[PDB]
Design an enzyme around this catalytic site. Sequence first.
Site, PDB file in Angstrom:
ATOM      1  N   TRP A  81       2.947  14.098  33.996  1.00  0.00           N
ATOM      2  CA  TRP A  81       3.750  14.765  35.008  1.00  0.00           C
ATOM      3  C   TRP A  81       2.874  15.452  36.058  1.00  0.00           C
ATOM      4  O   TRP A  81       3.172  15.378  37.257  1.00  0.00           O
ATOM      5  CB  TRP A  81       4.707  15.738  34.320  1.00  0.00           C
ATOM      6  CG  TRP A  81       5.515  16.582  35.230  1.00  0.00           C
ATOM      7  CD1 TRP A  81       5.268  17.882  35.571  1.00  0.00           C
ATOM      8  CD2 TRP A  81       6.713  16.207  35.915  1.00  0.00           C
ATOM      9  NE1 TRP A  81       6.233  18.338  36.425  1.00  0.00           N
ATOM     10  CE2 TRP A  81       7.138  17.333  36.654  1.00  0.00           C
ATOM     11  CE3 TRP A  81       7.472  15.032  35.977  1.00  0.00           C
ATOM     12  CZ2 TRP A  81       8.296  17.321  37.447  1.00  0.00           C
ATOM     13  CZ3 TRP A  81       8.626  15.020  36.771  1.00  0.00           C
ATOM     14  CH2 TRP A  81       9.023  16.158  37.493  1.00  0.00           C
ATOM     15  N   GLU A 122       5.305   8.761  36.284  1.00  0.00           N
ATOM     16  CA  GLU A 122       6.510   9.592  36.228  1.00  0.00           C
ATOM     17  C   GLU A 122       6.866  10.052  37.642  1.00  0.00           C
ATOM     18  O   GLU A 122       6.399  11.101  38.082  1.00  0.00           O
ATOM     19  CB  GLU A 122       6.288  10.790  35.284  1.00  0.00           C
ATOM     20  CG  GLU A 122       5.709  10.423  33.893  1.00  0.00           C
ATOM     21  CD  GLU A 122       5.657  11.611  32.934  1.00  0.00           C
ATOM     22  OE1 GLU A 122       6.193  12.672  33.315  1.00  0.00           O
ATOM     23  OE2 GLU A 122       5.085  11.486  31.815  1.00  0.00           O
ATOM     24  N   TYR A 123       7.680   9.269  38.372  1.00  0.00           N
ATOM     25  CA  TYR A 123       8.287   7.996  37.967  1.00  0.00           C
ATOM     26  C   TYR A 123       8.350   7.052  39.177  1.00  0.00           C
ATOM     27  O   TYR A 123       8.267   7.506  40.303  1.00  0.00           O
ATOM     28  CB  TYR A 123       9.711   8.194  37.418  1.00  0.00           C
ATOM     29  CG  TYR A 123       9.835   9.223  36.326  1.00  0.00           C
ATOM     30  CD1 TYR A 123       9.568   8.896  35.009  1.00  0.00           C
ATOM     31  CD2 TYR A 123      10.228  10.526  36.612  1.00  0.00           C
ATOM     32  CE1 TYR A 123       9.669   9.839  34.012  1.00  0.00           C
ATOM     33  CE2 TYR A 123      10.338  11.472  35.620  1.00  0.00           C
ATOM     34  CZ  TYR A 123      10.057  11.131  34.318  1.00  0.00           C
ATOM     35  OH  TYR A 123      10.161  12.082  33.321  1.00  0.00           O
ATOM     36  N   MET A 187      11.174   8.829  27.004  1.00  0.00           N
ATOM     37  CA  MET A 187      10.948  10.272  27.104  1.00  0.00           C
ATOM     38  C   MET A 187      12.279  11.029  27.117  1.00  0.00           C
ATOM     39  O   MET A 187      12.609  11.769  28.044  1.00  0.00           O
ATOM     40  CB  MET A 187      10.116  10.587  28.337  1.00  0.00           C
ATOM     41  CG  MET A 187       8.827   9.808  28.388  1.00  0.00           C
ATOM     42  SD  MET A 187       7.615  10.416  29.573  1.00  0.00           S
ATOM     43  CE  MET A 187       8.621  10.624  31.016  1.00  0.00           C
ATOM     44  N   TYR A 189      13.516  13.681  26.418  1.00  0.00           N
ATOM     45  CA  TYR A 189      13.399  15.118  26.267  1.00  0.00           C
ATOM     46  C   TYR A 189      13.242  15.737  27.655  1.00  0.00           C
ATOM     47  O   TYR A 189      13.297  15.048  28.679  1.00  0.00           O
ATOM     48  CB  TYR A 189      12.255  15.475  25.313  1.00  0.00           C
ATOM     49  CG  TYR A 189      11.024  14.599  25.404  1.00  0.00           C
ATOM     50  CD1 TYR A 189      10.596  13.833  24.313  1.00  0.00           C
ATOM     51  CD2 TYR A 189      10.257  14.563  26.572  1.00  0.00           C
ATOM     52  CE1 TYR A 189       9.442  13.039  24.400  1.00  0.00           C
ATOM     53  CE2 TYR A 189       9.105  13.785  26.665  1.00  0.00           C
ATOM     54  CZ  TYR A 189       8.711  13.029  25.588  1.00  0.00           C
ATOM     55  OH  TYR A 189       7.576  12.278  25.711  1.00  0.00           O
ATOM     56  N   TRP A 337       5.563  13.749  20.830  1.00  0.00           N
ATOM     57  CA  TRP A 337       4.798  14.480  21.837  1.00  0.00           C
ATOM     58  C   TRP A 337       4.864  15.961  21.474  1.00  0.00           C
ATOM     59  O   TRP A 337       5.950  16.547  21.517  1.00  0.00           O
ATOM     60  CB  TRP A 337       5.385  14.232  23.232  1.00  0.00           C
ATOM     61  CG  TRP A 337       4.728  15.036  24.339  1.00  0.00           C
ATOM     62  CD1 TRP A 337       5.059  16.292  24.751  1.00  0.00           C
ATOM     63  CD2 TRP A 337       3.633  14.619  25.178  1.00  0.00           C
ATOM     64  NE1 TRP A 337       4.237  16.692  25.780  1.00  0.00           N
ATOM     65  CE2 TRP A 337       3.359  15.682  26.068  1.00  0.00           C
ATOM     66  CE3 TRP A 337       2.851  13.460  25.250  1.00  0.00           C
ATOM     67  CZ2 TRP A 337       2.325  15.620  27.017  1.00  0.00           C
ATOM     68  CZ3 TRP A 337       1.828  13.402  26.195  1.00  0.00           C
ATOM     69  CH2 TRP A 337       1.575  14.474  27.069  1.00  0.00           C
TER      70      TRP A 337
END
Length: 368
Positions: A81, A122-123, A187, A189, A337
């Site tokens: 990120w 991302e992304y 991902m 989350y 993660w």
Amino acid sequence: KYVRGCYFTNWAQYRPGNGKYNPEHYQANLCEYIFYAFAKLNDDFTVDQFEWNDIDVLYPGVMKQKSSQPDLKVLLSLGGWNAGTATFKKMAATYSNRAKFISSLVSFLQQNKFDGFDLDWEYPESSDKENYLLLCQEILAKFEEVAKCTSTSRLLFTAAVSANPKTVDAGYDVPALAKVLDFVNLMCYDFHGAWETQTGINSPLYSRKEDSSEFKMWNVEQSSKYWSDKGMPKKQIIIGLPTYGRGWTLSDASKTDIGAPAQGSSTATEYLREAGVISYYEVCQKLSSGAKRVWDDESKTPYLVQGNQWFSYDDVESMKAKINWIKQENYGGAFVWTLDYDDFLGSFCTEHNGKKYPLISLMQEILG
């Protein structure tokens, strides 16, 4: 039958005290795959190490683990990120730029003895959809070319992908990528966090009746379903398991419900020192301090209250419920993660009698 994956992070070496995570802290057979986060993508599109001690110390340190787990596969992850999309967008816009990245990449993998590559852009956006496709197609092609050439197993090639359907629509040609990627790491989350003005769940297994319309697919279940329906085979969807939590400072310490109003992020914790974020072992410290726990059966996750501090997180019960649901639904597996968020010493928590990796051990245990 089931993928079991774990992200190592090359900055966990800089946590204070017993929060410091080293490759020697890994455990044999915890993970089939160890995703190393992250490589550096230079401005000129070449790949280099990100941390000053990766090539010399950390990369080989992780690789030594194969000594006691011989089919451990280690892949290099690039992006994340913090990296943003600016270099990525440019690197992918022309054949000759991707060729420079790919060739640079193939060489950096060979020199440092990785088994594969993990792209965590991302992304991709609308303007990047087609570029992204070509980038991945060409990565598989060179990997295929390199393997026949050098008479080796082909390098593995995975992607960490977005769990938000609107982004999946924008930036991923899902049926094409299925033909090209080994598997995707979903991902599922960060669905809710301190960027919001009320408490929500970080990684809810199911949706909740009180969720508003924009969030009815912002759960593990329905986001994995979306990838399935867009044309990714379930066995190539790998479910993300978060060993961290997110937290708010409550606006009023008497309204402490999922949805209670909040005035800002949870105070930065002792080890991760990132406001709005808590490691699992930090949660165990808080429990030990008379922080109170609340199960939410709808979403199958716990939250934690203590003072004006409110965290959504994931524990042994929530992990047991998700991994079991991975088997029940026949998705391709799970990944965690991160490694350094669990109670990797087995000494921050007491409910588990000192078991190391209370959370991550669930993968090998339940998924075999």
